[PDB]
Amino acid sequence: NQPVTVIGLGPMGQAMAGAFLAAGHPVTVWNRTPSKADALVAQGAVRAATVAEALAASELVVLSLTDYDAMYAILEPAADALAGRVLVNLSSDTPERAREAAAWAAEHGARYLTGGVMVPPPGIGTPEAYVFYSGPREVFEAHRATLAVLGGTDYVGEDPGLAQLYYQAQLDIFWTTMTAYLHATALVGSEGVPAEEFLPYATEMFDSMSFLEEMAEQIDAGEYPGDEDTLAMGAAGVDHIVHASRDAGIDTALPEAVKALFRRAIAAGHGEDSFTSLIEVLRKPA
Amino acid sequence: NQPVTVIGLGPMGQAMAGAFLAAGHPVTVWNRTPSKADALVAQGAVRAATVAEALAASELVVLSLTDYDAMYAILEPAADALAGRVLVNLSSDTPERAREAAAWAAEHGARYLTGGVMVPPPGIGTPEAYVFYSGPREVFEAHATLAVLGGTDYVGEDPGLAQLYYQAQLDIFWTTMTAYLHATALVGSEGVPAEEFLPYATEMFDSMSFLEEMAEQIDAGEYPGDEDTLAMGAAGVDHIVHASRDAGIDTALPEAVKALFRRAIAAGHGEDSFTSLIEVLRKPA
Ligand SMILES: NC(=O)c1ccc[n+]([C@@H]2O[C@H](COP(=O)([O-])OP(=O)(O)OC[C@H]3O[C@@H](n4cnc5c(N)ncnc54)[C@H](OP(=O)(O)O)[C@@H]3O)[C@@H](O)[C@H]2O)c1
Ligand SMILES: NC(=O)c1ccc[n+]([C@@H]2O[C@H](COP(=O)([O-])OP(=O)(O)OC[C@H]3O[C@@H](n4cnc5c(N)ncnc54)[C@H](OP(=O)(O)O)[C@@H]3O)[C@@H](O)[C@H]2O)c1
């Protein structure tokens, strides 16, 4: 009961359009590569010939593109067709690029919402699916239901860049943690321990991290009471990891980066504070 | 019952000695700072007057010291008393330093078990604690007393293995903690409290349920890159670097991740699964 346009027919976009179509929403679609639409048009989507047609076809225009450079390459030549439309950009990019695009959309008559999808293309439309949303609350509340088709709707604030900040911070946890798991698996692997043999121990390590609330409370108070886990303690242990990694013939760049941050914080006088104090150097460029 | 000596009465050694004592073992203790044994001695522990008498008091000698340098400083002047003893070094150090110490102990007639303790001092004695052990399987099998401290997790004969497993677990711990704090600082740049983002970060960690598929890929050495290629990850890491830069936060951690992705792409893995990054992590630059 709401027309929807989907610019961007990549794995993600195709999934969104299909979910919109399977929810019964009128769906118009466009893509630099039309062949990517043959499937949805066969399922009942309208392949627009131009970007202008797609934009006019619906007020709600959801964008799933590689990056914002792609958006501007698509939409700028049709910028005079953006008036009245609501652009919901779900493409990954920087917060600042989102705040710049929001201003660009405004000057061209369009409203702008930023979105960060937290599921793979296949996950779109499942209970585990949720999308960070930021921008004008009224515009969000006006199109929440339509967007819920794709997954949970999580409005995080008015700043257009906030949704992407949340997304980037989550991927910052993800990729860095994945690299740590691979580095540790390589370390034990240097003595012939299969990855599937270390997996139980790695898995239980992550289940042991049930104290993040305490750390978050420390950060939010700006107080890092030392007690059972000084930063100096972690610094000594990180040195053992660096030295073990070297001895084992594996890469040392990752543990060395962690070590240098600990040294920064100790030089700043947090050695006796809780290791949460490390955030104080993480927030300050060296 | 079965005597046990504990050398090193810092927070961990004090907790280990207490556990042995509460479990009914005869316990002899030694520490460079003797005041730290007072509370234990008041409960039945024997304060050895000399390191060598501590070694002689029990065949099983548990060491809980800062590093292996502390061990040699303590034990070398008394190396002739190591004969017949079983040294169980629960001190954190490198796998190579463990192998070296095992050879030194054998030169003095002592057997050697390496241990890696995966709980803080308050965690000793819970059945939910565990300790990696490596060294002669017959020596580990003969020394029930160790279970007083927590689970006994024997990883093999190589004396370096227990510390290898331990350093790898701590590798995950500290790097993941650094990532959590950096990401928390990133959203905090715009005033999002850590306690508001934590629910989302917790979901992230609870969503890591594919590590098995990664484990099988590593063991096969096959990194089928179809769904999530390394190139796609690198592009995401670049946005993270740039967002961190724009936010005024330190970029060293994300730049370190970015450099590893670049190395893997330069090794031909751009279109492989992100697990292929292990091929650069297994080899120095
Ligand atoms: N799970 C996820 O994959 C996920 C999660 C969160 C966010 N995102 C964001 O959503 C995007 C889309 O998901 P994806 O990675 O599956 O697909 P993708 O490969 O990034 O496809 C992006 C889309 O952008 C289009 N495009 C790129 N450059 C263009 C240009 N110069 N002119 C016109 N169109 C251009 C592509 O058209 P063609 O099809 O013709 O190449 C394609 O439809 C991601 O790149 C990311 O930015 C994805
Ligand atoms: N959460 C934890 O505390 C924890 C958890 C798991 C593993 N570990 C590991 O277990 C070991 C024990 O740690 P801990 O918590 O007890 O604190 P610690 O400060 O590492 O232990 C200090 C102990 O080592 C002794 N020592 C240090 N340098 C010495 C030297 N040069 N000569 C003689 N004795 C020396 C101290 O003697 P004095 O007491 O006389 O000063 C004391 O008995 C460490 O290797 C640590 O990495 C700790």
DSSP B171-229: HHHHHHHHHHHHHHHHHHTTT--HHHHHHHHHHHHHT---HHHHHHHHHHT----SSSB
Pairing of strands B151-156, B130-134: parallel
What are the residues whose beta carbons fall under 8 Å from the beta carbon of A200, sequence distance 6 or more? none
- Radius of gyration of chain B from its Cα atoms, rounded to whole angstroms: 23
DSSP B273: B
Among A173, A250, A161, CA closest to B194: A173
For Cα atoms A181, A186, A187, give the angle at the middle one, nearest 5 degrees: 100
Determine the residue among A124, A128, A172, A251 to mutate to test chain B binding: the one whose Cβ has the most chain B Cβ atoms within 10 Å. Answer: A172
Residue A135 has φ and ψ, to the nearest 5°, of 135, -170
A158 lies within 8 A of chain B by CB: no
Strand, helix or coil for residue B24: coil
Nearest CA in chain A to B205: A206
Q: What is the DSSP letter of B30?
A: E
Question: Within an 8 Å CB–CB cutoff, is residue A93 touching chain B?
Answer: yes
Resolution (A): 1.8
| Whole-number Å distance between alpha carbons of B239 and B98 | 42
Is A275 within 8 Å of A212 (Cβ atoms)?
A: no
Domain covering A4-159 assigned CATH 3.40.980.10 in the classification: no
Place of tokens 């993600």: A12
Residue of A nearest to B199 (CA): A213
Put the strands of the sheet holding A27-30 in their side by side order: A46-47, A27-30, A4-7, A60-63, A86-89, A111-117, A130-134, A152-157
Report the alpha-carbon distance of residue A97 to residue B169 in Å, rounded: 38
Distance (Å, whole) CA A55 – CA A108: 13
Contact (CB<8Å) A171/B240: yes
Helix (H, G, I), strand (E, B) or coil at B62: strand
Can you tell me whether residue B88 is helix, strand or coil? strand
Distance CA A245, CA A116 (A): 36
CATH of domain B4-156: 3.40.50.720
- List b or e across B17-29, with b for residues whose CB sees 16 or more CB atoms inside 10 angstroms: bbbbbebebbbbb
Determine phi and psi for B259, rounding to 5 degrees.
Answer: -65, -40
Residue B280 at interface with chain A, using a CB cutoff of 8 Å: yes
As given in the structure block, the two tokens for residue B217 are 């890929």
Q: Which residue CA neighbors atom 44 of ligand 1 most closely?
A: A66
How many angstroms separate the CA atoms of B270 and B249, rounded?
A: 28
Which method was it determined by?
X-ray
Looking at domain B165-281, its CATH superfamily turns out to be: N-(1-d-carboxylethyl)-l-norvaline Dehydrogenase; domain 2 (1.10.1040.10)
> What is the identity of the amino acid at B170?
L
Structure-token pair, residue B12 = 């961990």
d(CA B251, CA B107): 49
Sheet of B86-89, strands arranged across: B46-47, B27-30, B4-7, B60-63, B86-89, B111-117, B130-134, B151-156
Establish if A68 touches chain B: CB-CB under 8 angstroms.
no
- DSSP letter for each residue of B219-240: HHT----SSSBHHHHHHHHHHH
CB contact under 8 A, A165 and B237: no
How far is the C-alpha of A1 from the C-alpha of A37, rounded, in Å? 22
CB B144 within 8 A of CB B120: no
CA A67 to chain centre: 13
Assigned CATH class of A166-282:
mainly alpha
Is the Cβ–Cβ distance between B24 and B4 less than 8 Å? no
Atom of ligand 2 nearest to the CA of A228: 1
Rounded Cα–Cα distance for residues A249 and B281 (Å): 10
- Give the span between the Cα atoms of A50 and A31, in whole angstroms: 9
Residues pairing with A207 in the sheet = none
Q: Encoding tokens for residue A284?
A: 């300050």
Full DSSP string of B103-157 = HHHHHTT-EEEEEEE-S-GGGTT-TT-EEEEES-HHHHHH--TGGGGSEEEEEES
Does residue A187 contact residue A245 with C-beta atoms inside 8 Å? yes
Task: Name the residue among A128, A202, A253 with its Cβ closest to that of B260.
Answer: A253
d(CA A42, CA A253): 51
| CB environment A258-284: b (16+ within 10 A), e (fewer) | bbebbebbbeeebbebbbbbbbbbbbe
For residues A167 and B201, the answer to whether their CB atoms sit within 8 Å is: no
The first and second tokens of residue A215, run together, are 């750390």
Task: Calculate the CA B257 to chain-centre distance.
Answer: 23
Nearest-Å Rg of the Cα atoms of chain A is 23
* CA–CA distance, B174 with A93 (Å, rounded to integer): 28
Cα–Cα distance measured from residue B125 to residue B118, given in angstroms and rounded to the nearest whole number: 12
Q: How many CB pairs under 8 A join A and B?
A: 306
Residue carrying structure tokens 């903690």: B177
Q: Domain residues of chain A, as ranges?
A: 4-159, 166-282
Q: Which residues contact A7 (CB under 8 A, 6 or more apart)?
A: A13, A29, A30, A31, A51, A54, A61, A62, A63, A64, A65, A71, A74, A75
Name every residue whose Cβ is closer than 8 Å to that of residue B168 and which is 6 or more positions away in sequence: A184, A185, A187, A188, A198, A201, A202
At A193, the amino acid letter reads: V
Q: What is the DSSP letter of B160?
A: T
Question: Ligand 1: which residue has its CA nearest to atom 21?
Answer: A10
CB contact under 8 A, B277 and A193: no
Per the CB < 8 Å rule, is B205 touching A170? no
Closest by Cα among A159, A149, A152, A112 to A131:
A152
Which phi and psi angles does A284 have, rounded to 5°?
-115, 115
HEC readout, chain A:
CCCEEEECCCHHHHHHHHHHHHHCCCEEEECCCHHHCHHHHHHCCEECCCHHHHHHHCCEEEECCCCHHHHHHHHHHHHHHCCCCEEEECCCCCHHHHHHHHHHHHHCCCEEEEEEECCCHHHCCCCCCEEEEECCHHHHHHHHHHHHCCCEEEEEECCCCHHHHHHHHHHHHHHHHHHHHHHHHHHHHCCCCCHHHHHHHHHHHHHCCCCHHHHHHHHHHCCCCCCCCEHHHHHHHHHHHHHHHHHHCCCCHHHHHHHHHHHHHHHCCCCCCEHHHHHHHHCCCC
Instruction: Name A89's bridge partners.
Output: A63, A114
List the single residue in B164, B236, B275 with the smallest CB-CB distance to A92: B236
